[PDB]
Design a binder for this molecule. Structure first.
Ligand SMILES: [Zn+2]
Length: 307
């Protein structure tokens, strides 16, 4: 509450708490972090990304987004813990220090703020945005099916009332377009990771097409290494592979889009658990989850700096 050191990372928080946390962090490490506003949600809430950088101009960057599906609380929670961790580990962990001395990291903790607020206010299991319209009383779009990557193809629904509704057109949701314009405008992203829950999977493209990506052998080996690291702390077992062979066909996904933009290291994580608690993972699992996920992400970042 008064400092990032007194914030309670072992519990779930509301939107205002997370937004205040951002300002506290910026206030404590002004030389390392900054808060940028890249848009406003459908209901007018600011959409914030924290930029972590030791300098330079347009250094190659890493994008990390959490919370695009609002009910996946473990992700925003992990997001806050990563933010703090970056500031703690810089100058202490040689590997992480190396990364930040040459690359910037952009972290979007609450990608879909309107749905997150709704999960606190009215329906804890809501996952879509809260955009509305005309030919329906149904609200919202599955923001992870609204990207311009196989948009509208099989693996998304065209019914507005569906939980997997893709939206009227690619990028119709301001929460997605805001990320699209910012990444396009920056043009120097090297890695793009989107964090979700649950299932314990580490996936790479594609989900909209059976076509294999050209960098399959490399991403697969990176995935295997990342999974090996993450398991190292608590024994948590992940499976990895391309989206479509691992799960099923899914269209309009963020990582299919990022990869098609030339961002080679595009991965999606589906965090704990495997169904015992599902979306309502206990607060007592937050820190362990965060800690082990960090080892998996740090592994991908290292490969990134080096390649
Ligand atoms: Zn999700």
């Amino acid at each position: 509450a008064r400092s990032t050191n007194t914030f309670n990372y072992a519990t779930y928080h509301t939107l205002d708490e997370i937004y205040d946390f951002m300002d506290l962090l910026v206030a404590e490490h002004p030389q390392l972090v900054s808060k940028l506003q890249i848009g406003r949600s459908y209901e007018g809430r600011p959409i914030y990304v924290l930029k972590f950088s030791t300098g330079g101009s347009n250094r190659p960057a890493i994008w990390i987004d959490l919370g695009i599906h609002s009910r996946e609380w473990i992700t925003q929670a992990t997001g806050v813990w990563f933010a703090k961790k970056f500031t703690e580990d810089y100058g202490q962990d040689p590997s992480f220090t190396a990364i930040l001395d040459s690359m910037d990291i952009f972290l979007e903790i609450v990608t879909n703020p309107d749905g997150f607020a709704f999960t606190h206010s009215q329906n804890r299991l809501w996952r879509k945005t809260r955009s509305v319209t005309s030919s329906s009383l149904c609200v919202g779009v599955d923001a992870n099916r609204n990207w311009d990557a196989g948009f509208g193809k099989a693996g998304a629904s065209s019914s507005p009332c569906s939980e997997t509704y893709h939206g009227k057109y690619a990028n119709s949701e301001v929460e997605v377009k805001s990320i699209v314009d910012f990444v396009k405008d920056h043009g120097n992203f090297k890695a793009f990771l989107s964090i979700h829950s649950y299932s314990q999977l580490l996936l790479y493209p594609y989900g909209y097409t059976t076509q294999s990506i050209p960098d399959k052998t490399e991403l697969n080996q990176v995935a295997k290494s990342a999974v090996a690291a993450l398991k190292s702390l608590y024994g948590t077992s992940y499976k990895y592979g391309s989206i479509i062979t691992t799960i099923y066909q899914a269209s309009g996904g963020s990582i299919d889009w990022s990869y098609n933009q030339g961002i080679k290291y595009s991965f999606t994580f589906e965090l704990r658990d495997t169904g015992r608690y599902g979306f309502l993972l206990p607060a007592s699992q937050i820190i362990p989850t965060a800690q082990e996920t960090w080892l998996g992400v740090l592994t991908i970042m290292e490969h990134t700096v080096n390649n």
